[PDB]
Design a protein around this ligand. Sequence first.
Ligand SMILES: [Pd+2]
Ligand SMILES: [Pd+2]
Ligand SMILES: [Pd+2]
Ligand SMILES: [Pd+2]
Lengths: 173, 173, 173, 173
Amino acid sequence: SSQIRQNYSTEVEAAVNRLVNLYLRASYTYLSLGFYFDRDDVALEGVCAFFRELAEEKREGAERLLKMQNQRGGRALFQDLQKPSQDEWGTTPDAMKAAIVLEKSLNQALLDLHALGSAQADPHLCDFLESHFLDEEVKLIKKMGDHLTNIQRLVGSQAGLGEYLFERLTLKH
Amino acid sequence: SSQIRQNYSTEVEAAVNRLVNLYLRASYTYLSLGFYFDRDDVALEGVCAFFRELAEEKREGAERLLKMQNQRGGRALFQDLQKPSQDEWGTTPDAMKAAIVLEKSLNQALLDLHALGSAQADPHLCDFLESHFLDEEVKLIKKMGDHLTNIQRLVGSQAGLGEYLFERLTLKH
Amino acid sequence: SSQIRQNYSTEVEAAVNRLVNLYLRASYTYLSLGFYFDRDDVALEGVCAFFRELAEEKREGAERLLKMQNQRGGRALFQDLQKPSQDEWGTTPDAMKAAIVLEKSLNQALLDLHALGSAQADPHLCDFLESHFLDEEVKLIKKMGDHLTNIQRLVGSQAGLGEYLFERLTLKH
Amino acid sequence: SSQIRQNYSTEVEAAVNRLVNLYLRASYTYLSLGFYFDRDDVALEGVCAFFRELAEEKREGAERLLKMQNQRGGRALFQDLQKPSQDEWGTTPDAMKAAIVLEKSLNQALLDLHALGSAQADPHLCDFLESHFLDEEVKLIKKMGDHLTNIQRLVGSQAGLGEYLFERLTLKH
Ligand SMILES: [Pd+2]
Ligand SMILES: [Pd+2]
Ligand SMILES: [Pd+2]
Ligand SMILES: [Pd+2]
């Protein structure tokens, strides 16, 4: 039961639960991406760290959604988390491309939920999504696009050398 | 080309470019206002500093817009910047009135863009505009209105004395 | 009016106003160069920062000229600012070449004004120009020439790799 | 005798001695202006301090000239110092006007000496004059013009009140 729920539709409640699943799926995907780059036959630690950081960011996003669900008086419902789409992630550009596709899918899910919020006249939801999610997605996708452009520029010259240089000079910290 | 653009209409992209032009025009206008008050035959340094600060604020606004344009995958297009509407700006109340007219025009441009964002279901744009621009405009216009009221109150008593006192006791820092 | 003007010709006054326009035009050009390198499909942040810094330097130069105009009792007159000569700036060497052409044009304008100062026996003007402008131009043009030589050396080997390495190892800070 | 003199004309040597006399005369004038404003029937201490500071600046200028005379191997020759042109200096605008006339006369003397330096191909002299004298004069005359404009603006409203306010709010430190 709840004694606090106000202006919070069942449609939004369900969409928030689905979004939590998407964010946790994304986190899982990034966990797989990170460890792939830590394989001794891949060995690009800056790339491992980049994706591991994203895994943490996506988990944090799911937790923020869940906190908000409870703040509004909605009820968390969890579903199975599907395994990531690949077991091996190819080259650095392959991985960065996959990451952009993933982020665009999350961004579209956020946009869809914001639209539902608007249709349901739920300004708390719509603002929650922008502050913690929509601006972060735009910034993140720009960073990934910039990364992809740099790695593409590098591997068009020399693939092995380019991947090493990108990891050493852009990613490693 | 872009590999990041998502939910960013050509209409909004063009409107953002036009807004950059308006902000740069405003910056240019404030540069002219500031130096007019630094003329040896005007010599009101607090007024010079007030308008110079605004010139910097408007330039910063244009830069923020341009950064956002690139974040969204839009493409900056610059146009000629028209010279300010006057070469000489009259009395302090004349100048403050001109400044209010200018800010109201920027504010209306922001409102128009927010409306376009709403019509295009672009919540990232609409929120970007409020956070960095719409609240700043409201605060700035209130300050200018307060200034205009004070200078009008002063120059209704004694024009020369009133302009000096306003610059010394309200503006100078 | 002015009560301070002394040994300040109308010819120099007009030339200073034209120089302000040239410096503001240059600033605008550098703003465009900087944001071009921040495009997600270009993504060379060290180059973005290099040109943005120059945009600020040129704006500062215009402001110094304007302050001097008022110090001498001349009157600032502003004209339209033409848009930069290109919308897209090509490769890093293309951009650095454009920048050198631009600086050489400013340098020539400064030399022309110094010559006018000499012809008008205006030592305050001639010294003002050397201290704040002429030595800065020489230093800046040497830096740009050095940059161009380095990027040319790099892209003659491998274009993509060379542009990345230059941005990472010379420009980025 | 001298064992160091090189490229230092007798014409420049004599002109430097005359300039020392002019600077000392100016210092004396400012001493008189300062004490006039300290009269119990005038009693404008910010004005006293303003002119006393100028008296010190002009004395310092004479000393710099004398040091340079000896550096070049010229020989200091002192003449009688004429008393200031007035015993009483009238109102604050009267005094500021007198001060501007005085500074313009020094500035013209500096310009005349720079021209002589140029005619004698004496670059050390010409540069000495710009660095320590010509830029200082331009700055000082702009400040005085700004002051005169402010006091005129004030006394056009109310003479007694305006003079008090200027001394309290612009000059006093
Ligand atoms: Pd909303
Ligand atoms: Pd909105
Ligand atoms: Pd010269
Ligand atoms: Pd010279």
